[PDB]
Write a protein that binds this ligand. Structure first.
Ligand SMILES: NC(=O)CC[C@H](N)C(=O)O
Ligand SMILES: [Cs+]
Ligand SMILES: [Cs+]
Ligand SMILES: [Cs+]
Ligand SMILES: [K+]
Ligand SMILES: [K+]
Ligand SMILES: [K+]
Ligand SMILES: [K+]
Ligand SMILES: [Mg+2]
Ligand SMILES: [Mg+2]
Ligand SMILES: [Mg+2]
Ligand SMILES: [Mg+2]
Ligand SMILES: [Mg+2]
Ligand SMILES: [Mg+2]
Length: 94
RNA sequence: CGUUGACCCAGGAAACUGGGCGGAAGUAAGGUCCAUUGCACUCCGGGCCUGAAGCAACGCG
């Protein structure tokens, strides 16, 4: 939401983009900010235009957040929040 | 779809078994047109057009 999460929630994503290449482009732009646990993207009716990237450390998520906030990606301005709830791996990876 | 195999994973002392992995399907995916600004982590909106593939080989449609 607005409380620092390992995982950022991105939206206003250009839905015209194919799935894997939407990752590929996302994973590159963001891996700069730190180790990246995974990137989830569905093009379903209600999951499209949105991506979850999960970082190892919280600080990576935080830095990725404000730095990239509101920038144009594929001709559309990203909106970034902290994700409302922790991504699954965070537990599973224990 | 069948047979004989490769490789990964789970179980098993093992033999092997299951999945990954085939005619799958007008599915995935692609173009367009509509509709959606959507908080998820076991697919998964609709129309038209186009349209695949198991990892290898052979056999069969
Ligand atoms: N998809 C398939 O069933 C492939 C069969 C084909 N005859 C082959 O040997 O590869
Ligand atoms: Cs085994
Ligand atoms: Cs198999
Ligand atoms: Cs469509
Ligand atoms: K048996
Ligand atoms: K098989
Ligand atoms: K088969
Ligand atoms: K399409
Ligand atoms: Mg064993
Ligand atoms: Mg087997
Ligand atoms: Mg077989
Ligand atoms: Mg489709
Ligand atoms: Mg259709
Ligand atoms: Mg073949």
């Amino acid at each position: 939401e607005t409380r620092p999460n390992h995982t950022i929630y991105i939206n206003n994503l250009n839905e015209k983009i194919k799935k894997d290449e939407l990752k590929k482009s996302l994973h590159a732009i963001f891996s700069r900010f730190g180790q990246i646990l995974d990137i989830l993207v569905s093009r379903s009716l209600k999951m499209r235009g949105q991506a979850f990237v999960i970082f190892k450390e919280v600080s990576s998520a935080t830095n990725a957040l404000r730095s990239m906030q509101g920038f144009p990606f594929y001709d559309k301005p990203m909106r970034i929040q902290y994700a409302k709830t922790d991504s699954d791996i965070i537990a599973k990876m224990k």
